[PDB]
Design an enzyme around this catalytic site. Structure first.
Site, PDB file in Angstrom:
ATOM      1  N   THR C  43       0.841  -1.205   0.000  1.00 26.05           N
ATOM      2  CA  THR C  43       0.000   0.000   0.000  1.00 26.05           C
ATOM      3  C   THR C  43       0.888   1.272   0.000  1.00 26.05           C
ATOM      4  OG1 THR C  43      -0.231  -0.130   2.381  1.00 26.05           O
ATOM      5  CG2 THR C  43      -1.908  -1.174   1.016  1.00 26.05           C
ATOM      6  N   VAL C  45       0.774   4.696   2.605  1.00 29.51           N
ATOM      7  CA  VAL C  45       1.344   5.349   3.820  1.00 29.51           C
ATOM      8  C   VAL C  45       2.326   4.448   4.591  1.00 29.51           C
ATOM      9  CG1 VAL C  45       0.812   6.363   6.160  1.00 29.51           C
ATOM     10  CG2 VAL C  45      -0.730   6.749   4.231  1.00 29.51           C
ATOM     11  N   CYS C  46       2.020   3.145   4.616  1.00 35.19           N
ATOM     12  CA  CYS C  46       2.811   2.140   5.332  1.00 35.19           C
ATOM     13  C   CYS C  46       4.351   2.155   5.064  1.00 35.19           C
ATOM     14  CB  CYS C  46       2.227   0.750   5.067  1.00 35.19           C
ATOM     15  SG  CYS C  46       0.370   0.567   5.422  1.00 35.19           S
ATOM     16  N   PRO C  47       4.804   2.114   3.779  1.00 37.77           N
ATOM     17  CA  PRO C  47       6.263   2.101   3.538  1.00 37.77           C
ATOM     18  C   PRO C  47       7.070   3.301   4.039  1.00 37.77           C
ATOM     19  CG  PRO C  47       5.078   2.545   1.484  1.00 37.77           C
ATOM     20  CD  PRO C  47       4.045   2.064   2.510  1.00 37.77           C
ATOM     21  N   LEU C  50       7.758   2.797   7.762  1.00 38.74           N
ATOM     22  CA  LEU C  50       8.665   1.656   7.940  1.00 38.74           C
ATOM     23  C   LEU C  50      10.107   1.997   7.527  1.00 38.74           C
ATOM     24  CD1 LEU C  50       6.395  -1.204   6.505  1.00 38.74           C
ATOM     25  CD2 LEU C  50       6.919  -0.803   8.876  1.00 38.74           C
TER      26      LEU C  50
END
Ligand SMILES: [Cl-]
Ligand SMILES: [Cl-]
Ligand SMILES: [K+]
Ligand SMILES: [K+]
Ligand SMILES: [K+]
Ligand SMILES: [K+]
Ligand SMILES: [K+]
Lengths: 186, 165, 186, 186, 186, 186, 165, 186, 186, 186
Positions: C43, C45-47, C50
């Site tokens: 997806t 926003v997630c990366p 992280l």
């Protein structure tokens, strides 16, 4: 088993030919459907069974059969798998994501300690009744040609009530007509 | 489903090659087994399917596979059917009677409003583990050759775990 | 409320630096741990969150802090994501797969209607006690520098029991010492 | 889990700028609200955090954000504290008294063995939905600047649905627009 | 009522003559005790009552009676009030803080809708048995001379068993000797 | 405690000035009432207390206060005691008999192991709300002057709402006016 | 026991004089009925008893009495048995199949550990009321003449209530 | 049904040949028994069925069969009936009284709304197993000669296991030998 | 039903010949006991019955029979009553006080709406077994002469087991000896 | 306790003066009733008590009192007993059969381990209220004259509500009138 029962309502997101779509049981009404469950995307095995269904997909659509592959991964994952693998890239049918496990549980096909679906195929008729079920362990291939055969047989008995298809039945072959005089005769 | 679960203990009478025998899960230990359920003796689809399995029985026996047909009729009825039909008379594997329906329910395969088993085939390995399941509606035939292919695949992955891509 | 509670036992598969491993609550004993939950692989926003944590990973390891990212995706999916995103490729900490959702429920962090975890971060000490919690809605990013500040403060308080770190506390600034005399005087 | 759930009804007495007022959930409707929980009046970490919020209260009001500090002390005690501490004296927002603990338990934030609330901050949107949560252990201070950052991101996302603010997002920075095309690319 | 029952165990922090201490049921063993509950610090009626008790504190200490005032405010709050009010600054007895409400509830003295104790006074003997109860309504002040009267009478009854103090018993007045002969003679 | 709760309905027989009557909660509506419980007729301590109340009965009637003494003996027994004892013969107020224990239990005043009431006094206002409670142990006599003091103070509070009687309030002494300005000033 | 209770509703397939028919409790209304349970087709005691009832069937039909034999086998099995045994081929009354076992359990007559009915005979009057019950162990024969005597007594007391001493 | 089940323990008083005796299940062990139930003594019908058993009783005892007639009347009633009726006077077997209904209920033979037993006969073998059951409505005579026949058949199969008695079997007649070759042959 | 059941344990205070004593079930063991319940002291029907028993107490003692009158009044009240009534003054047996109602409820003899016992008399043998019960409505008097008759018959039957006293049986009259022979003859 | 309770509905068959009849609670409405229970027909103590009641039956009918003897025997047994005993032949009242035991349980009078009723007599008024109860053990006879006395007294009290019949009261003797003046004066 769930043989001869009606499928339950569902609502899932899916990847289909470059687009994200929504699938519910209402999309299955009046149609023949194949629910094809598999444990997980992006494992180290060639996804041959899904590719073999894709090879037969034009013919399945001519027979008015819709195909839905299902795993507990997301439709996001399906889309990435579809871009990364040539085999998966052949798929033009809907890849349903089932991260809640609800569709998988409706078909009693969850491995609860793993959170993955088992390798099960279900054939559902236009009234929502399950007409065939196939479940195998890993390494035991599901043959798309045996699946086509079963579907043709299911469509045939639906179009010719009063007739049943014996073992190994194929188009052109003789059928049986359940009657009193046939009792104990075969 | 019951895929990858161990079969449950059972004790049933059977007809086999002119005699009545008792079959329990101890007879399946160390062997590959095919449990072949069908709804009723003295009917129509049931014998062609049973005959097709009888035609491959020699071959299944060359692969170390035992076959058990199961219905809710008695072993008495199987014996009578074996004497009156030319297709059934070819059967040399055990015909189990399941009148209490316990063996059928162990395999979750009962049509509860009919008291008859559904058309189900189970492949069970030497450790009692169910490796393949097939269930079809009344009128959709099983293919004994597809069954054989699966049994060979099951035996291969057991002998050679991990051979993939 | 999970603040000041002990983490529950878990056993999960993970992807870490090119290999698959098992991670359990025992691997956290005696160490500082960050459990970083996010909803889904592949997806948007997630990366960035992280990767931002991957940038502080050298500093965190110097402070004795281990990082665990968690989603309900499988470890296979993590590996695949790791190979295809330039941002994820820089992750050198363990990427835990939680397809049963059991670890996510341990932290009471499941979106039950989605089968995905919420955007939550937990700071856990060597005794398994959660010392800080942060949860944000779907579009609001986390800031790994604020995360670092909280870890440092947590370490200080563990190291100086009769002291407390006030608001906006940074290493070297004036701490407070709870006592009878200090009551009502700030 | 309280992220993305609606706040519950409440009715409490509060001290605000020299008067006692009643605060209910109806005061929060159509407004952005910050619920700033703290354990006790006349203690040490508590005033530095409350003063820091006061430093930002002008800006928060300008953005339509109301603040409510909350502890299990009475509103009488908040007034005495407001008069005795130069830090508390600068608070211009409502200091809610929760001696029944009812408001603290609505937010699941009671230290049941102490009868004091934990150090939690909740960001609530005009529809009553909790968009951000922060909880820290007794000795760890919260940072109002990061609270501001989150409020601005939550407000942006409310205003640009279809967009999201990535990690470290601040006013006037690049935002992501979720699409099928963007999946697995960052 | 709780008359003639044994007090339940408790553990509370308190303020006493510029120092914080812990009080438990063990501190009352072998001693006579007065538990003086009041609703809230920094209010109006509460200090006048607490002061009235403070005036009589030397007389009480001579009689081997210890005083323990109680409210659901914390011990921090009691300290501030002690510094803040000239009435309260003269209290040399222990000011117990009962923020959990456990001690108040042991004496069934909670206003469950306010989270404040009622105005109740309990006399407890060296064996922990409650010998006198007084509860008055919000706004009616108690009177320590009455309290002393009940205390002196309680002590006589304990030091002279087989005798009973009639109405209005003061030191030196006649006492009754319960017997068969006296039945219906008064 | 039962302070500030409404009395429950009751129906009891009683003896009053040579006649038997029925008393119910309706007889107390619009009046001030004193419920004077005692353990048993023809005992020792009980008459001295009841007599002390009888002495103050004219003063009480002027204040609109009705007296109702109560024990679990019958009204027949009260009559005999009235004829038998010179102390009891001077009682002109109603002697309620509560052999079922219902009235005693409404006031949570039963010694369940003896079937006798404890020595408790309850002040009830015209709206049936208990404004003062006193319970003493077997053998400690109550004092009616205290009772009158509490009664006069209760009545002032009702006739002058917004004011409160501080400790040792007698007629003519200063009263407090609860307000914001007065918080922590005493 | 079920003596003097009304029979419960049922719906079963039967073999009767070369055809498969459906039988329900509506076919028993206004008629005297004998429900004759036995354990299994293609066995031993069962046919002599069934044949003895077949020998009295004309007579039972002269008295307005219908006979229904019941076992947990299917109507298919009854048809097959009727074609292969000389004793069963004499049966002209309905042979009901009860594979779900519902009719047997309605008469509280199931051997639950065998899935077979016990050897029970029930006489049921035109109002559905059970008037006589007989149950015997495996190996103790029923007497069709004693059954006839009872049916005549039941019909007599129905026609002439109260004729005693 | 209770066919092929073991009889339950019992303890009843009985009338037998001018004497009152006690009967329990221990009296049935190792013997053949007939339990002959009937609704009531002293009704207006000639008790022919019981008389018919009495006529066969010498022969039943030669076969080692004990007879117990049972009704819910008392053994006192049985004795009077035996003196008043010539038919009943012929009975030399035990007449059990079962006023608690317990023996009747053990054989599930009670008409609960009447408190009388139904007209049931049970044949029990030496191990306590019920081998035959007969129940009739009123007016439908139980024939003692059909009972003797059944018993002789029960005794025969017990003495010749591997053999079964076909329909209408009588002594001298042929029996069947259950075997595979006999399957479908008769 | 209490006929032929054993009395339950009890512990009560009683007035007997100028002293207060404790009575328990151990006082009744090995003795014949009459428990004479009555509703209330200082009433009307109650004394005439109690006096009538007193008239027979000499004879009852001579026969080894103890008497215990019982009401829900206290033992204090019984003494006052003993002093004021010339009828009660002649009572030389124990007058038990049952203010908890526990002894009255053991005998199932409470008028639950009145908290008074009903007019019941129980005859108890040396083994604690209740052999005779009499209960009458409020206005109906009991007759001690018939109580005597019953005690003498119960004592006779204890002494001549195998015999029984028929209706109207008195000392020195014909008794029946149950036998098979006597059945249906009288 | 069934004293002063209403009889429960019943429907039973009875033998009365040469015929069989149904008796229900409706046949008692508006009349005085005696329910006379006994254990068994054709025994020894039972007939003398029943005959003794038959001797007073003319007097009882003149007082409007109906008699019902009850046992768990059937009405057939009663009739037979009536024909064979000279004592029972003189019974002209209804002999109820209670083989289900339902009427006996209504009166809580069953020996559950015997299936027989205890020796109990109940006096029931026209409103169905039980006004007197008598129960005796197996060998102690009842006295119908004492029964008559109680019925007369019961009738008097029903006929003169503000009066009560004292101990040993006979027709014409001095009754008592409960009032305030009579309290404690007998
Ligand atoms: Cl949350
Ligand atoms: Cl009783
Ligand atoms: K998943
Ligand atoms: K509090
Ligand atoms: K079957
Ligand atoms: K009482
Ligand atoms: K009976």
């Amino acid at each position: 088993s769930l043989i001869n029962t009606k499928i339950k309502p569902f609502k899932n997101q899916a990847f289909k030919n470059g687009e994200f779509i929504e699938v519910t049981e209402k999309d299955t009404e009046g149609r023949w459907s194949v629910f094809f469950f598999y444990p997980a995307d992006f494992t180290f095995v060639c996804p041959t069974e899904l590719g073999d269904v894709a090879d037969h997909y034009e013919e399945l659509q001519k027979l008015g059969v819709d195909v839905y592959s299902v795993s507990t991964d997301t439709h996001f994952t399906h889309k990435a798998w579809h871009s990364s693998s040539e085999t998966i890239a052949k798929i033009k049918y809907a890849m349903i994501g089932d991260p809640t496990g609800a569709l998988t549980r409706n078909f009693d096909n969850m491995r609860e300690d793993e959170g993955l679906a088992d390798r099960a195929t279900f054939v559902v008729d236009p009234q929502g009744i399950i007409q065939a079920i196939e479940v195998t362990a890993e390494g035991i291939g599901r043959d798309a040609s045996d699946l086509l055969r079963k579907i043709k047989a299911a469509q045939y008995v639906a179009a010719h009530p009063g007739e049943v298809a014996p073992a190994k039945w194929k188009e052109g072959e003789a059928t049986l007509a359940p009657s009193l005089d046939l009792v104990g005769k075969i």
